[PDB]
Amino acid sequence: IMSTNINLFSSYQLGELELPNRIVMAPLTRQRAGEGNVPHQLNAIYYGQRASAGLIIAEATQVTPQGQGYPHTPGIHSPEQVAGWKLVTDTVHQQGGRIFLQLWHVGRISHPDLQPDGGLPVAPSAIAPKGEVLTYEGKKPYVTPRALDTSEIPAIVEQYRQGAANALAAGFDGVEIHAANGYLIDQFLRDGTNQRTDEYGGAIENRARLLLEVTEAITSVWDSQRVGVRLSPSGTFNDIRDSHPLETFGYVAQALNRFNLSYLHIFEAIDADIRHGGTVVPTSHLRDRFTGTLIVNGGYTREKGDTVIANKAADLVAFGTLFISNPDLPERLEVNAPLNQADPTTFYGGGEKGYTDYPFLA
Numbered sequence: 001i002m003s004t005n006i007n008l009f010s011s012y013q014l015g016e017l018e019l020p021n022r023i024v025m026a027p028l029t030r031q032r033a034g035e036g037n038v039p040h041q042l043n044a045i046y047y048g049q050r051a052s053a054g055l056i057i058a059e060a061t062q063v064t065p066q067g068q069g070y071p072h073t074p075g076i077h078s079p080e081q082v083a084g085w086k087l088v089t090d091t092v093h094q095q096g097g098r099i100f101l102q103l104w105h106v107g108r109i110s111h112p113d114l115q116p117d118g119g120l121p122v123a124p125s126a127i128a129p130k131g132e133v134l135t136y137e138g139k140k141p142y143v144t145p146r147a148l149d150t151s152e153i154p155a156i157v158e159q160y161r162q163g164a165a166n167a168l169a170a171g172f173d174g175v176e177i178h179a180a181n182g183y184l185i186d187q188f189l190r191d192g193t194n195q196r197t198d199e200y201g202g203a204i205e206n207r208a209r210l211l212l213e214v215t216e217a218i219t220s221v222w223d224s225q226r227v228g229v230r231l232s233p234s235g236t237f238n239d240i241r242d243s244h245p246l247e248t249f250g251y252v253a254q255a256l257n258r259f260n261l262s263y264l265h266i267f268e269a270i271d272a273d274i275r276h277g278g279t280v281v282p283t284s285h286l287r288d289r290f291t292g293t294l295i296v297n298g299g300y301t302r303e304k305g306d307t308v309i310a311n312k313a314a315d316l317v318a319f320g321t322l323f324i325s326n327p328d329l330p331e332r333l334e335v336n337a338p339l340n341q342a343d344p345t346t347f348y349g350g351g352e353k354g355y356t357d358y359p360f361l362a
């Protein structure tokens, strides 16, 4: 096969997976799980509708009950949940698509009202996040999470591993480790949330240890090239920050090479991050260190996407917002068609409205 100019619509070889284009559907929490946090027919339709994506990353999905921080997010810990997700993966596959499950644990970003037996959210350190959390009794302030004991860490790792094994049984093509957006793995990574004094805190190699041990466990379940990791090096979402972001995420980028992963997925800096002035980590910093497939994300367009692909800054481009509103986003981007405008009042929770009722092209 001859040399060609690559763009958003070029095929890609993601391990054994043949991606029809470079367009990825970002993971998107929609809070529309059914009873017992089990996916159902409506969720299958939703993902099925978007199967023209080169790859779908499914919404954040908790690997364990303690890992839930928002009502009606799906889980991947129970047989009923596995059955539910199988319905989703079958539908995506019948539609000729590919889908990875994003494996979740919210850590301190939860509330006792959402925890089993009203227990405490767990975290690297007993540090209460600022602001409020939505519970069934309206908005309540966060409480101080419970700091995990050192000998509790193998249990967390087992929770991810079991979650990944369940995703495998549920027919997914791969998994993405949610190490971003201020949730549990991210909480351990960054020193604003991690003030431990054992082998999981302090020096960067310690702060990275949970992520690396979780990654190792999951590659004992999946072929490593079906395992991805998502980071948000510049994000402050959920009251998280790191004193030396370049050092921290630079180290992680390099350390992940030994695992021969499917990809590294970067949620890039939003305007809020620059304007409130945390150190912005350039994606090029991570591109120079992680040697495998790189997915970039955050406010991308057809033009910005072609740009990063053509100039080799990234290999895949994930879209979030635009996939909510445009189920056939790849087709529309290709022909420069008009795009449906997303309705943020229906991003979270509810039913088919603002979920499955966005119209296909023409």
Ligand SMILES: Cc1cc2nc3c(=O)[nH]c(=O)nc-3n(C[C@H](O)[C@H](O)[C@H](O)COP(=O)(O)O)c2cc1C
Pocket: 026, 027, 028, 029, 030, 059, 060, 102, 178, 180, 181, 230, 267, 297, 298, 299, 300, 318, 319, 320, 321, 322, 347, 348
């Ligand atoms: C409604 C909504 C739900 C999201 N859910 C997740 C999620 O479950 N896991 C995750 O890593 N990121 C999640 N994100 C962040 C997006 O995946 C993405 O990085 C962000 O929307 C920026 O991409 P975009 O500009 O293309 O929308 C969510 C974003 C939105 C708006």
Ligand SMILES: [Ca+2]
Pocket: 016, 017, 018
């Ligand atoms: Ca193949």
Ligand SMILES: [Ca+2]
Pocket: 288, 289
């Ligand atoms: Ca290098």
